[PDB]
Design a binder for this molecule. Structure first.
Ligand SMILES: CC[C@H](CO)Nc1nc(NCc2ccn(-c3cccc(Cl)c3)n2)c2ncn(C(C)C)c2n1
Lengths: 822, 248, 321
């Protein structure tokens, strides 16, 4: 068995959802921001936000909506986790004591159901009579909000429309009514149903179905003054209410896909819209009042306000303050002005909230030679792309280098006092037949620049028609100074060439230090790329020189230096290249038993390969024979996202299901098969998507019980550390967890053991071989009575004594030492 | 695709046994003794009749590729029965076959099994499988004797007498090289033909074509009387040579 | 000739790697040196000498050389490793290489199945089962792992190691629990021991539902717990729906918590009607009332599917990378 410890060095920073209401007090205006597993509560002021409370939950927050049922003084909070843990929460404050109450809770998972394409949707009736959940195709689940439903029991209503895009509860209906957009072979449609809690089925909806735009994306429920609903698409916005139908199709919205909406005026006159290029629009409902006294909708208008960060959620606060919740870039508070500035913008930034964004890659380098280590991360996407330099200071100091294009891979080259960064920018087919960039970015603002002139793929005779307005990616290699972080050189790769892998190393007997990039020719027609290049560059005297190129018949997903040789994975094949005295790459040996070799790691003459579906394989280079040998493989199927070697026997992997596992050689020579079986000994549900594993620590270097240091970056910005334990230390800490879980009260009453259970759509296993460091570190934050309750009947083993009673003060010291690893 | 497991009578003059100086009579006796050994051993163990036949068919085929002087017959027989049990889903442990073989063999005979009877047998399994070319599925005259008899309609007692007498002839044909000469379908017809002659029955009357004097043609196509007579002669020769007489 | 198996050496294949671990030996992927065809070699080790050549392999050699169907895996030949008594080398069963296995495609989560894709899949599987059942052979271990699919969309059945002949006239004692629990019929849970070909049908019905949910329908760890899950969906075993249930050894012993009513149509309301009816018949408690393989082929869901339209699934590609 293997024993490992996982701690969270930096909490998730990406904003996954945000709502406003009166949650803390019926008087205050609250802003609830949801980061993965983290709930942040703020109070709105005239300058900005006053933080009040932050809680963690043992689950990924999927639904978060505020409501106030008749009889309550203030708003209640509903949250549903990605594992289908539902609960209703209440804020309660007694003087200085702030606590979160679990009013109702339960798990709404169905034994049989197909998870929907557009994900979990949660909505609540305007009269707060029921909670609507769309978890599975063809099924609509209703949790009635009666006082007695403390277990959140629910029933399903059969839904004929299998493929639903978005559903909302409507205002101004005699019965609870849902309006939704659905897709069938004839296109997309908008339809209504009535929800009867008494009959527990659907009845005919208030107004008829209408055919809608093929890419209808979002359903906005209009308030009582107007009624009906608005449907947001790619090219058109439409309003539907019985006989009434209005449609506006302005050309500005076509350029970029609209992703988020919010209501500015409670009466529905004004809504806010945001798009992927960061533009912020105001959607205006122009009123027309008849002599009858009724208020009808006259027309719809869209007006551009300015530019914000690419926003996952928008939420209007008060005055002109709008909170921009960004998952791909930094979040913001921005002020909307009635008068535009001299550039034509009505939007002016107030504050910037650091979001490490998607961490696509990262490396650790001690720039200042301070024996510490700094983390330089590829963070953000598109306009929000950035390089982030992170150092330990008690807070982390973060420097941001804006790139305005997507960073892909990073590697440090000390000899040249610079970093090599792969980046891609979006250009659009223009009337010239070429492409035009939407904005200047790092690859276009380099001091010196170069463009590949490789004639390898100049064989053409391949049809690749281009239509005006289509997007394309342009890939570059950036040379960036390690002190100024100024773009020194930008090398643009061939048309339709994607840069996938990057390394900095010396090869063979060649004393020169090179930048080596592995690429793939990506054409929309090809399911799997069938052309690629391995390019050797030398950065010398401010210029990047093309030293050699080797054509490959596939995509160079991963490369790594292997004892003076170049180890590269091209599609199924894993290959080892020697660097000749003629400065060219020469193939030595190949291994082909892979569905798709996405990841590579080396320790000594051992290689760990990460497959798309076949989990991990332990390869070995046999120097006497000059070829590869399969040592062992994890036969259990997993979809890998990143891998790492912990030691000569333990191997770490990350799954696309937010799970982590540790494989070890079975160390049993009885049968050769046992050696060839990598047995999964550690299972742990992290809750984050791990893109990069990296050896190193940010601590300024007492010998801690933990040995080894592996950092990992995730899609939501979370950074964590994986370290190993001795059997004695694991058992002690594991026994303590079981004690802490009985003592610590969880938000929503979510069992900790369930949260950390290895979970795929198909499987659920109890965690093993992993200690939740965050749980152990929480021991220092629980009250003294709870501390002593935890340590009751605790004995140490295999150490100072076989049985050694522990005190609450002794553990305070042990945990405090554990907090020093991060 | 599939191997050919049938030889001509003239070819039996050139088995490995014959060419190592064994005369025709001796190889014939060695085959009867090995067949009866397999038959008797499996019967003591309570084995299905197909399992006995399969082992005997393996045994007969084996010595078309090897010589009796180099491979002891009783060890080969025990190995064949061992494998036959697994093939036909009537498995027995090798130790039980050795136990039964020891009960039925004298001390000189059991000397073939050498110092370690189980080992000598288990080792031979490799050669046996390679020799029979891993063609494990075998059909026997029994299933055809019944399939064809079921299509006969008439005096229940006369037909049942025909079946049992023919069934006895099938058991007796396992000791002869006919299993290596003619497909089982023909054997089943031949034994029906023989029993009919001995019982003075006219089988055509019991068929759906009572005026088709060559009654067998509806069961097995392209079989001349020449073949059926050759088969009958060989079976009857076995009875004439022994002290035993036709069952009747 | 092509028929003289057991003599050609394994030298003729270049071993690529180990695709999986097999019960009688590990399965290796390989390439033929002469033709270039990719093959799969199953190692058969008789060196144990406990009972010699494994019967599980004997069953597969005996049955698969008789069975010839597009939806059945084909054994090409048997080859050997390089003093007969001293020889302890192993044998290898050569088979066609299959690109992917159904459990792998689903466990990785990479594949998405459309209705038409499911139609082609089930029709091929049922046709192969019908061929085998017509030949009076029972697989006895239908599982996602044993269904093998090429990128072309062809499906072949494999792992016939637990397969045996079925006699309608003379039912004979068999093994009591052969199929994996997740795909085991209720009759085996109650210990019928004289099982009918319908045991395989129940398994293939479980697959049908799993293809629609992308999650196995009945997942448990204990035989009783499985009966509970099956009982909740298909209804509790009772004499009204299964007249002969009282004859089964464990009927009184193994009881569900309640006498649950059948809810299959309700819980699978999202499934198309044509398939839902097929599922209802395939997942019938009483083996005598459970549909046959031929009957599944003569269903509104599969009868009109044209196998020329192979309809390959969404197999791994770069956009998934
Ligand atoms: C023994 C268990 C089951 C069969 O019941 N496995 C299985 N799979 C076959 N092919 C699909 C497959 C499954 C896994 N991979 C695979 C590919 C690349 C890399 C990796 Cl690590 C794994 N490929 C296959 N072809 C022929 N046979 C038998 C008949 C010899 C096969 N047996």
């Amino acid at each position: 068995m293997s024993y490992n410890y996982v701690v969270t060095a930096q909490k998730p920073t990406a904003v996954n959802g945000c709502v406003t209401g009166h949650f803390t007090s019926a008087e205050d205006l609250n802003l609830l921001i949801a980061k993965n597993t983290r709930l942040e509560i703020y109070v709105v002021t005239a300058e900005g936000l006053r933080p009040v409370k932050e809680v963690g939950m043992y689950g990924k927050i999927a639904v978060m909506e505020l409501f106030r049922p008749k009889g309550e003084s203030k708003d209640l909070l509903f949250i549903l986790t990605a594992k289908y843990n539902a609960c209703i929460l209440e804020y309660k404050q007694s003087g200085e004591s702030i606590d979160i109450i679990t009013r109702a809770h339960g798990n709404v998972q169905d034994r049989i159901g197909r998870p929907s394409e557009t994900g979990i949707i949660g909505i609540i009736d305007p009269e707060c009579r029921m909670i609507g959940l769309r978890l599975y195709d063809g099924l609509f689940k209703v949790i009635p909000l009666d006082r007695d439903n403390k277990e959140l029991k629910a029933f399903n209503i059969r839904l004929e429309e299998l493929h639903v895009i978005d559903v909302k509860f409507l205002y101004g209906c005699q019965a609870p009514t849902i309006c939704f957009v659905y897709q069938d072979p004839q296109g997309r449609h908008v339809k209504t149903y009535e929800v009867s809690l008494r009959e527990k089925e659907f009845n005919k909806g208030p107004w008829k179905q209408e055919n809608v735009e093929a890419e209808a994306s979002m359903v906005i429920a209009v308030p009582e003054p107007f009624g009906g609903a608005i449907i947001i698409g790619q090219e058109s916005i439409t309003y539907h209410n019985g006989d009434k139908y209005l449609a506006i199709a302005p050309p500005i919205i076509k350029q970029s896909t609209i992703v988020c909406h919010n209501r500015v005026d409670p009466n529905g006159s004004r809504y806010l819209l945001g798009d992927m290029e960061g533009r912020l629009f105001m959607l205006l409902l122009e009123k027309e009042e008849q002599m009858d006294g009724t208020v009808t909708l006259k027309d719809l208008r869209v007006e551009l306000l300015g530019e914000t960060s690419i926003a996952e959620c928008l939420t209007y606060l008060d005055n002109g303050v709008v909170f921009v919740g960004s998952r791909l870039g930094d979040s913001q508070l921005v002020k909307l002005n009635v008068d535009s500035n001299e550039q034509g913008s009505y939007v002016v930034a107030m504050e910037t909230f650091t979001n490490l964004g998607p961490i696509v890659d990262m490396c650790v380098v001690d720039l200042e030679r301070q024996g510490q280590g700094q983390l330089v991360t590829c963070s953000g996407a598109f306009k929000e792309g950035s390089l982030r330099i992170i150092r330990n200071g008690q807070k982390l100091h973060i420097r941001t280098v804006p790139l305005y294009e997507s960073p892909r891979k990073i590697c440090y080259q000390e000899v040249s006092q610079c970093f090599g960064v792969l980046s891609s920018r979006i250009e659009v087919q223009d009337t010239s037949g070429g492409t035009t960039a939407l904005r200047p970015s790092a690859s276009t603002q380099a001091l010196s620049s170069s463009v590949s002139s490789s004639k390898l793929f100049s064989s053409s005779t391949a049809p690749h028609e281009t239509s005006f307005g289509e997007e394309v990616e342009v890939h570059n290699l950036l040379i960036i100074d390690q002190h100024t972080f100024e773009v020194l050189h930008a090398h643009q790769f061939l048309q339709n060439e994607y840069a996938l892998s990057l390394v900095s190393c010396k090869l063979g007997k060649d004393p020169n230090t090179y930048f080596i990039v592995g690429t793939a020719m990506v054409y929309p027609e090809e399911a799997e790329p069938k052309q690629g290049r391995i390019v050797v560059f030398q950065y010398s005297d401010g210029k990047l020189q093309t030293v050699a190129e080797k054509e490959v018949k596939g995509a160079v997903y991963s490369m790594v230096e292997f004892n003076g040789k170049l180890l590269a994975s091209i599609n199924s094949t894993v290959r080892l290249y020697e660097w000749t005295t003629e400065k060219e790459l020469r193939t030595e040996c190949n291994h082909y038993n892979n569905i798709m070799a996405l990841y590579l790691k080396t320790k000594g003459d051992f290689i760990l390969v990460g497959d798309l579906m076949r989990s991990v394989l332990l390869l070995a280079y046999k120097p006497m024979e000059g070829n590869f040998e399969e040592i062992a493989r994890d036969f259990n199927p997993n979809w890998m996202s990143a891998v790492e070697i912990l030691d000569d026997d333990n191997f770490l992997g990350a799954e696309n299901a937010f799970n982590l596992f540790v494989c070890q050689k079975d160390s049993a020579a009885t049968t050769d098969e046992e050696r060839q079986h990598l047995q999964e000994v550690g299972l742990f549900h992290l809750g984050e998507f791990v893109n990069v594993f990296c050896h190193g620590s940010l601590v300024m270097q007492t010998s801690t019980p933990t040995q080894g240091s592996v950092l990992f970056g995730t899609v939501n910005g979370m950074i964590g550390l994986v370290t190993s334990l001795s059997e004695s230390w694991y058992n002690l800490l594991l026994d303590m967890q079981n004690r802490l879980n009985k003592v610590i009260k969880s938000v929503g009453k979510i069992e900790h053991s369930f949260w950390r259970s290895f979970h795929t759509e198909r499987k659920t296993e109890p965690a093993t071989g992993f200690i939740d460091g965050d749980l152990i570190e929480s021991f220092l934050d629980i009250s003294r009575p709870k501390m002593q309750e935890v340590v009751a009947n605790l004995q140490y083993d295999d150490g100072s004594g076989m049985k050694r009673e522990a005190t609450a003060d002794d553990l305070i010291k042990v945990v405090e030492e554990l907090t020093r690893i991060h | 695709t599939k191997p050919c497991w049938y030889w001509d009578k003239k070819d039996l003059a050139h088995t490995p046994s014959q060419l190592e100086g064994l005369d025709p009579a001796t190889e014939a006796r060695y085959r009867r003794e090995g067949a009866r050994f397999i038959f008797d051993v499996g019967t003591r163990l309570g084995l299905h009749y197909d399992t006995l036949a399969t082992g005997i068919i393996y045994f007969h085929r084996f010595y078309m590729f090897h010589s009796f002087k180099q491979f002891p017959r009783y060890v080969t027989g025990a190995c064949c029965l061992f494998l036959a049990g697994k093939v036909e889903e009537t498995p027995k442990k090798c130790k039980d076959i050795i136990k039964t073989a020891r009960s039925l063999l004298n001390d000189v005979q059991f000397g073939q099994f050498g110092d370690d009877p189980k080992e000598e047998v288990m080792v031979l399994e490799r050669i046996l499988l390679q020799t029979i070319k891993f063609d494990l599925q075998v059909e026997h005259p029994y299933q055809f004797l019944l399939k064809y008899a079921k299509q006969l309609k008439g005096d229940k007692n006369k037909i049942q007498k025909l079946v049992q007498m023919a069934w006895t002839f099938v058991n007796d044909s396992l000791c002869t090289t006919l299993s290596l000469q003619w497909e089982p379908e023909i054997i089943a017809v031949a034994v029906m033909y023989l029993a009919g002659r001995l019982c003075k029955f006219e089988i055509q009357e019991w068929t759906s074509k009572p005026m088709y004097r060559r009654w067998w043609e509806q069961f097995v196509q392209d079989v001349p009387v020449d073949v059926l007579e050759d088969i009958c002669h060989q079976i009857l020769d076995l009875y004439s040579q022994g002290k035993q007489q036709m069952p009747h | 000739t092509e028929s003289d198996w057991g003599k050609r050496c394994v030298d003729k294949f270049d071993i690529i790697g180990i695709i999986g671990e097999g019960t009688y030996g590990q399965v290796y992927k390989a390439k033929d040196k002469d033709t270039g065809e990719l093959v799969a070699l199953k190692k058969v080790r008789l060196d144990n000498e406990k009972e010699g050549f494994p019967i599980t392999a004997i069953r597969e050699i005996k049955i698969l050389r008789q069975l010839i169907h597009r939806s059945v895996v084909n054994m090409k030949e048997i080859v050997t490793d390089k003093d007969f008594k001293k020889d302890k080398g192993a044998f290898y069963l050569v088979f066609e290489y299959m690109d992917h296995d159904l459990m792998g495609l689903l466990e990785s989560g990479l594949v998405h199945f459309s209705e038409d894709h499911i139609k082609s899949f089930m029709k091929q599987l049922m046709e192969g089962l019908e061929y085998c059942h017509k030949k009076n052979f029972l697989h006895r271990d239908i599982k996602c792992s044993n269904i093998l699919l090429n990128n072309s969309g062809q499906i072949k059945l494999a792992d016939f190691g637990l397969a045996r002949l079925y006699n309608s006239e003379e039912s004979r004692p068999y093994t009591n629990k052969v199929i994996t629990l997740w795909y085991r019929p209720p009759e085996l849970l109650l210990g019928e021991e004289r099982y009918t070909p319908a045991i395989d049908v129940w398994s293939c019905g479980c697959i049908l539902g799993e293809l629609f949910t992308k999650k196995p329908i009945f997942q448990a760890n204990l035989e009783l717990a499985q009966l509970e899950l099956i009982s909740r969906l298909c209804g509790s075993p009772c004499p009204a729906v299964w007249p002969d249930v009282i004859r089964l050894p464990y009927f009184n012993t193994m009881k569900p918590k309640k006498q649950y009513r059948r809810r299959l149509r309700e819980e699978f309301s999202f499934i198309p009607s044509a398939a839902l009816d097929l599922l209802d018949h395939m997942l019938t408690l009483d083996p005598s009332k459970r549909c046959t393989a031929e009957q599944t082929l003569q269903s509104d869901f599969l009868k009109d599917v044209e196998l020329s339209k192979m309809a390959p699934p969404d197999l791994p590609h770069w956009q998934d990378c």
